[PDB]
Amino acid sequence: TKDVEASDYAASSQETTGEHAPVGNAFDKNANTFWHSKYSNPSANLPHWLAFKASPGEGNKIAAITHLYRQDKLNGPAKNVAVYVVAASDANSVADVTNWGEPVATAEFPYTKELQTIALPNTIPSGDVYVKFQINDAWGLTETSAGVTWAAVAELAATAKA
Numbered sequence: 001t002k003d004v005e006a007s008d009y010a011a012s013s014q015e016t017t018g019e020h021a022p023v024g025n026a027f028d029k030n031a032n033t034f035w036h037s038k039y040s041n042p043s044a045n046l047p048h049w050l051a052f053k054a055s056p057g058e059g060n061k062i063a064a065i066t067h068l069y070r071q072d073k074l075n076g077p078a079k080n081v082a083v084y085v086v087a088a089s090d091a092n093s094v095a096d097v098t099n100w101g102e103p104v105a106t107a108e109f110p111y112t113k114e115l116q117t118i119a120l121p122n123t124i125p126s127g128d129v130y131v132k133f134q135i136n137d138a139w140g141l142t143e144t145s146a147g148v149t150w151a152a153v154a155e156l157a158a159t160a161k162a
């Protein structure tokens with residue numbers, strides 16, 4: 001698998017007050033930086049999401065989404081998550097996508113900071129697509145604690161069959 005060019009980043013919210021965690025940090029190929037949902041007041045509640053345009057080249061269809069948690073500490077990583085994909089011809093930009101359709105994939109991540117890979121069905125649109133990665137709930141401050149209400153992602157990407 002090969003990494004797919006990403007562009008046109010969007011997020012349901014982002015924290016820039018309590019720390020510097022804007023949406024761009026989930027796409028900069030740097031495991032030491034992350035996007036964080038907004039938790040300073042007025043805070044954002046679940047679900048949280050990130051969205052981007054994936055451009056695998058004409059003729060190709062993306063194969064998977066990868067997710068890398070923040071790497072400094074465990075602080076309630078994503079648990080149940082969902083992936084939406086729409087053809088790029090459906091809207092002018094990521095921000096113009098109103099209807100994401102049914103999820104093409106769901107996963108329950110284990111309690112960890114290691115890289116997660118979500119395989120996508122071979123029936124999704126080929127070509128350039130808009131992608132939304134959505135965190136519906138989260139792990140707790142420990143593995144058996146009540147789930148937290150925020151989210152953080154160090155790296156998000158699409159891959160394609162090389």
Ligand SMILES: CC(=O)N[C@@H]1[C@@H](O[C@@H]2O[C@H](CO)[C@H](O)[C@H](O)[C@H]2O)[C@H](O)[C@@H](CO)O[C@H]1O
Nearest residue numbers: 018019036039040073075076141150151152
């Ligand atoms: C600054 C710090 O270490 N704070 C701790 C909390 O961690 C922060 O949590 C907020 C969300 O509430 C952000 O996620 C931020 O990035 C984290 O550093 C931690 O959740 C609590 C409980 O252990 O202690 C705080 O001290």
Ligand SMILES: [Ca+2]
Nearest residue numbers: 025030033154
């Ligand atoms: Ca990063």
